[PDB]
Design a protein around this ligand. Structure first.
Ligand code: DAV
Ligand code: NA
Ligand code: NA
Lengths: 449, 449
């Protein structure tokens, strides 16, 4: 019984290309060092995807390892219901409101980012109903958005593949993605593009009626949708319209939270104030499953009041507010902001951007894009016309597979080659990643020209 | 700035009475010992609730503590997507199929039971759609059922409190609860009761159309709905009907999995064979957030064939199949099943019954119920007629409160008192539990009767 065999026999794989995994075998990982992972055959890889955006401190950070173990020595498990919670919970809440852009606020916990978005929607429904508008339920997101995998968070996610579940559910509207390169019109400037989306939102609000719309969620920079920075002035045009019609604005900071963008929050980087923040991933540097909904002052007041009218918030997850996870997050927050990880991103962003600009030079890259330590190259069959490769060429898989074969974990989402390495990444490691990526590109584009 | 005050300030409370957490100190917890917890001032309490059903090994178990720590030392975090996963992940999937009632099958990972129920539903929509019936979407559960708090899992839950959210969503149907004592009609026997719910199921299927019904979910014994064993023969009547009409049966084993009913699974205790299992909570003895969906032979083959047709299953949570969680799970499973914990439940269940049997003697306990290490006492004003006390006497929230005063954590649910202590409980600690409870009951029934 090999590892590959055992894996195939018992696993139902999620987000796994099945013809790749049948033909190649599951890669079974035993440990890591810095930004490297090592499999059971001893084969070693530079994971330029931070595992899954979240391992910003690498795969063996001593401080974080030591922090987790200490909390298990102290108090290994508990909950946050019935008027009881850990000291460690009370601590993170306090810490989180502080690092947040809000002056004061409140914090509710989940296990995943998906749960947090799901919770956020329910909070909105609860809130508008208690404030006299039970019909105020619709949820606005963007095409290419990714907000998670529960029925609701998947309805929030703007991707063709949710049709296999018969989603989105009624009440979830997808507006145009602010990706200027893809969706900008013949001879339309970036400013004209941003004005068209401001206009498109208002039309939607007119079409549906503000009294039926409960919220607007946005990632500051779109992550799993393939690293899409917003067109210039998007949030500046977008927010006032939402204030005008009394539509809560929620910032999904699950990827942008704590550093990847060049700041503590994506909404800092793009200079807007949300009514609430959804945080996860980096929150624990992938050491423990944690999610957080951070309500800004206005929603905090309103939710709090709404609760006391009824006497209980009948919502919550078994492991939410976990002593271990809260401890880890404190340490992770401290490590990122005070032990140089976030600054490392700001420092190396210029060089990272220089590498991609060099790489984008060839016939089959349409553009490069991103910010800080989150970036993507777009593969095209024809550059002038912007036309993608045929589905049957499986260009995405070829690139992933070839990268893996050269010792580089790089995961393309669609025809968007994504790079989101840990923050602990050294200039030499960054060179390693580029050199490996380039070879992969040469090989694949020549197979496929 | 006290602990109580810093708690109130930054925290949003889940499943918490606000009139009594504002009234009494918000209890902040530092550590534990065996089945006892210690707060920030130094008071000890016997937790007859295993934290939240899940701390079956107690709060300071040596082995689990070291297993958790050992894994942080070896590989503190990863994911299970894109053709990769940790060695821990593969061992756990193997061990879950073995330890489950299924001979063979497949495992999908979540962080919580709510996530896992939400997932199972999505799987069913996916599967039936792939097999040519996209309208097969409706989900059957029972009144009083508890399945989670995501929009979908809360819709599955049969509790009036979800109306604050405008839930249940369309498609979610609650059958009568199999609680003979409460829902048995005058003169009607238990055998007749079951016969009637059987008829109700078939009438519901006939009326909706079997092609529109995606699955049937049940807790073998209902937990957070107040510890309810099914009327005798229920699952023996329910199953044949579900099979006659091609409706997948899912056993929600989130509370009942791994020992609490006196067997490895609730479904073994009640001698029925489901099509898939939802597991969480005890899986990690509460040490880590983990959920699992274990598909039996038929649904495994069928889901895999559907995934295969489209080449990728577009579902998964970032922390799914986490290396630490799996390593911890793997250890909890071993501790419960091989180190006496499950066995101790069987050893002490008749003594547990004997205690409640005596307590239920009072004119104010209307009934005891449960099995293994999960029990309820139901409070009543008049025993002959089964009328409860008036709601405004908060007769349960008192017993819970005066219990906490006496050093016993005990959860009130409606008019009933719930006990589900850790599996490690000694005979002496069990008697301490009864001692402290009888005193609480004496004090509260004196006042209220
Ligand atoms: N956070 C999970 C990323 C999922 C990637 C995909 O859409 O293929
Ligand atoms: Na702040
Ligand atoms: Na088995």
């Amino acid at each position: 019984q090999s590892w590959e065999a055992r894996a195939e026999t018992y696993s139902l794989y999620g987000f796994t290309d099945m013809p790749s995994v049948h033909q190649r075998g599951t890669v079974v990982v035993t440990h890591g060092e810095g930004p490297y992972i090592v499999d059971v055959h001893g084969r070693r890889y530079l994971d330029a995807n931070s595992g899954l955006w979240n391992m910003v401190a690498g795969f063996d950070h001593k401080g974080l390892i030591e922090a987790a173990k200490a909390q298990y020595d102290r108090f290994p498990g508990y909950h946050a219901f019935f008027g009881r919670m850990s000291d460690q919970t009370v601590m993170l809440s306090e810490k989180l409101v502080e690092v947040s852009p809000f002056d004061n606020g409140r914090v509710f916990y989940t296990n995943s980012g998906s749960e947090a978005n799901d919770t956020m929607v329910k909070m909105l429904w609860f809130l508008h109903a208690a404030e006299g508008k039970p019909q105020k339920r619709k949820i606005l997101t963007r095409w290419n958005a990714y907000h998670g995998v529960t029925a609701v968070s998947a309805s929030m996610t703007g991707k063709p593949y949710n049709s296999v579940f018969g989603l989105p559910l009624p009440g979830f509207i997808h507006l145009t993605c602010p990706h200027y390169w893809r969706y900008g019109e013949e001879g339309e400037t970036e400013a004209q593009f941003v004005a068209r989306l401001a206009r498109e939102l208002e039309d939607t609000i007119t079409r549906e009626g503000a009294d039926t719309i409960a919220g607007f969620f946005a990632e500051p920079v779109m992550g799993a949708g393939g690293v899409i920075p917003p067109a210039k002035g998007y949030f500046q045009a977008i927010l006032p319209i939402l204030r005008k019609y009394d539509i809560p604005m929620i910032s999904d900071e699950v990827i942008c939270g704590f550093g990847r963008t060049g700041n503590t929050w994506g909404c800092l980087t793009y200079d807007f104030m949300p009514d609430a923040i959804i945080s996860s991933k980096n929150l624990t540097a992938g050491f423990f499953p944690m999610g957080a909904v951070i309500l800004g002052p206005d929603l905090a007041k309103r939710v709090e009041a709404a609760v006391e009218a009824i006497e209980e918030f009948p919502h919550g997850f078994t492991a939410s507010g976990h002593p271990v996870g809260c401890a880890i997050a404190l340490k992770a927050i401290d490590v990122v902001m005070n032990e140089g990880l976030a600054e490392n991103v700001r420092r190396l962003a210029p060089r990272f951007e220089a590498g991609l600009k060099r790489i984008a030079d060839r016939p089959n890259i349409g553009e490069y894009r991103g910010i800080g330590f989150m970036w993507a190259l777009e593969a095209v069959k024809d550059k002038p016309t912007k036309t993608p490769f045929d589905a049957n060429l499986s260009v995405s898989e070829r690139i992933a597979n070839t990268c893996t074969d050269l010792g580089l974990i790089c995961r393309p989402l669609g025809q968007s080659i994504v790079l989101c390495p840990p923050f602990i990444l050294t200039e030499a490691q960054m060179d390693e990643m580029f050199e490996k990526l380039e070879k992969a590109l040469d090989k694949v584009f020549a197979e496929v020209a």
